[PDB]
């Protein structure tokens, strides 16, 4: 939860139907290659965090997750996460 690049801290806060929509959007500018649905179909929140690190180096994993936070109506997590990042500039 406390790893310097870890997103699981934010992913755990998704409601059950927010998490499912997050996974749905991971399947589809977002030029990169999507995660297969095979991995996503059964994937818990812990599975997704691992899958985001497998398929996207850290900088991209964050950019995709932040953007998806905005699309599933979780602005609060988008701004909490930005805040963690900006705070490390101090």
UniProtKB/Swiss-Prot annotation:
It comes from the Eukaryota. Induction: In brain pericytes, up-regulated at the mRNA level in response to oxidative stress. It is found in: Cytoplasm; Inflammasome. Residues 1-87 form the Pyrin domain. Expressed in ileum intestinal epithelial cells. Not detected in peripheral blood mononuclear cells. Expressed in cerebral endothelial cells and, at much lower levels, in brain pericytes. Signal peptide: none annotated. Sensor component of NLRP9 inflammasomes. Inflammasomes are supramolecular complexes that assemble in the cytosol in response to pathogens, such as rotavirus, and play critical roles in innate immunity and inflammation. The core of NLRP9 inflammasomes consists of a signal sensor component (NLRP9), an adapter (ASC/PYCARD), which recruits an effector pro-inflammatory caspase (CASP1). Within the complex, NLRP9 and PYCARD interact via their respective DAPIN/pyrin domains. As the sensor component of the NLRP9 inflammasome, plays a crucial role in innate immunity and inflammation. In response to pathogens, including rotavirus, initiates the formation of the inflammasome polymeric complex, made of NLRP9, PYCARD and CASP1. Recruitment of proCASP1 to the inflammasome promotes its activation and CASP1-catalyzed IL1B and IL18 maturation and release in the extracellular milieu. The active cytokines stimulate inflammatory responses. Inflammasomes can also induce pyroptosis, an inflammatory form of programmed cell death. Belongs to the NLRP family. This is NACHT, LRR and PYD domains-containing protein 9. It comes from Homo sapiens. The lineage of its organism: Eukaryota, Metazoa, Chordata, Craniata, Vertebrata. The gene is NLRP9. The chain holds residues 5 to 96 of 991 of the full protein.
């Amino acid at each position: 939860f406390f790893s310097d690049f870890g997103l699981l801290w934010y992913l755990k806060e998704l409601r059950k139907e927010e998490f499912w929509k997050f996974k749905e959007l991971l399947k589809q500018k977002f030029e990169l290659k999507p995660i297969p649905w095979a991995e996503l179909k059964k994937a818990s929140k812990e599975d997704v965090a691992k899958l985001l690190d497998k398929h996207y180096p850290g900088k991209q994993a964050w950019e995709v997750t932040l953007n998806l936070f905005l699309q599933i109506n979780r602005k609060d997590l988008w701004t909490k996460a930005q805040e963690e990042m900006r705070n490390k500039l101090l």
